[PDB]
């Protein structure tokens, strides 16, 4: 597995439901690659951002971003993944509790094997 997610740091927690999500992603890359990493943030449903990283840097690297919150117009009233060349290889889920509180101490990391 050439790229591995080293960690995710939620940077504004807790925050307003209307505030944007500020994340810091740390990843490692063992050797150079030809295609792009695509990072998606998703509210499970609306996509809040899709960041693109290519050429992939070798070694340990970090990036921050600010993704915009979801729209309550689409949400019923009562109610992060990465891919290489379109092949999702890691996915992290969080629980979220208007003040939002992201339960950032219990991430749920799911890894898939792909061909790079």
């Amino acid at each position: 597995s050439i790229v591995s997610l080293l960690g995710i740091k939620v940077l504004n927690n807790p925050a307003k439901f209307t505030d944007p999500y500020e994340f810091e992603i740390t990843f490692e890359c063992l050797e150079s690659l030809k295609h792009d990493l695509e990072w998606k943030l998703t509210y499970v449903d609306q996509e809040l951002d899709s960041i693109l990283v290519g050429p992939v840097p070798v070694g340990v690297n970090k990036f921050v971003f600010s993704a915009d919150p979801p729209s309550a117009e689409l949400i019923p009233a009562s109610e992060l993944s990465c891919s290489y060349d379109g092949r999702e290889f890691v996915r992290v889920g969080y629980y979220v509790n208007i003040v939002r509180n992201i339960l950032a101490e219990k991430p749920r990391v799911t890894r898939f094997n792909i061909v790079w």
């Epitope: 500020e22 792009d36 990283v53 290519g54 050429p55 840097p57 690297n61 600010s66």
Partner: antibody
């Protein structure tokens, strides 16, 4: 979102000048700030960038040593301190912004620009 | 240092034509490539980001595509407001570099 440059003007070769870019509508801690310049009748040339979250700075070779880019996150403002100026630095200097910050030399597209501020270096 | 060789430097077209502007990168820049429009006395405006994504609020007649180190900006139906400079840009590596520009002038 808005970017407002100020500090342009006229100086002599070897003189100093400091541009400033006041940002509003976004936090500069999660966007990269750029300076792009355009000499009279020429194209755009990248000057410098700052990733204020990581404090990392990058310079075009023609200005390295002479220019210093910096940022104040509490004032949401970036600065381009231009020292040892040369006649070929005469240009309109634009402030620009790209979303996200990387810990390495890599940026997303510049989606907002200032209106530009003229800098003339001459005897 | 990666060079963005833009062509043509100047082209002459009518309203309603299709315009293709190309940019060749001297190395692989993946898709960290953007297209900007500039009119005289005004700041550049972003048109295409990440080589092929159309920026919010840009008329759909603009489009960009990638094929290796060859990047292509296409205007499907030239409008009166569209005559300006277009610059390509790579931001995959230090330094950020621009193409030399394409002035689209009206034919008469």
């Amino acid at each position: 979102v808005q970017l407002v440059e100020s500090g342009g003007g006229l100086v002599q070769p070897g003189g100093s000048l400091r541009l400033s870019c006041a940002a509003s509508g976004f936090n500069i801690s999660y966007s990269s700030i750029h300076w792009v310049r355009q000499a009279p009748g020429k194209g755009l040339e990248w000057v410098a960038s700052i990733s204020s979250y990581y404090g990392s700075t990058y310079y075009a070779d023609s200005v390295k040593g002479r220019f210093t880019i910096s940022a104040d996150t509490s004032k949401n403002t970036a600065y381009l301190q231009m020292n040892s100026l040369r006649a070929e630095d005469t240009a309109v200097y634009y402030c620009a912004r790209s979303r996200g910050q990387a810990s390495w030399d890599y940026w997303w597209a510049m989606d907002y620009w200032g209106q530009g501020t003229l800098v003339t270096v001459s005897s | 240092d990666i060079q963005m060789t833009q062509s043509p430097s100047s082209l002459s077209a009518s309203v309603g034509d299709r315009v293709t502007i190309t940019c060749r990168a001297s190395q692989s820049v993946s898709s960290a490539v953007a297209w900007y429009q500039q009119k005289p006395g005004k700041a550049p405006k972003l048109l295409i980001y990440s080589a092929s994504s159309l920026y919010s609020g840009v008329p759909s007649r603009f489009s960009g595509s990638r094929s290796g180190t060859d990047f292509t900006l296409t205007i499907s139906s030239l409008q009166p407001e569209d005559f300006a400079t277009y610059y390509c840009q790579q931001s995959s590596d230090d330094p950020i570099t621009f193409g030399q520009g394409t002035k689209v002038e009206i034919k008469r």
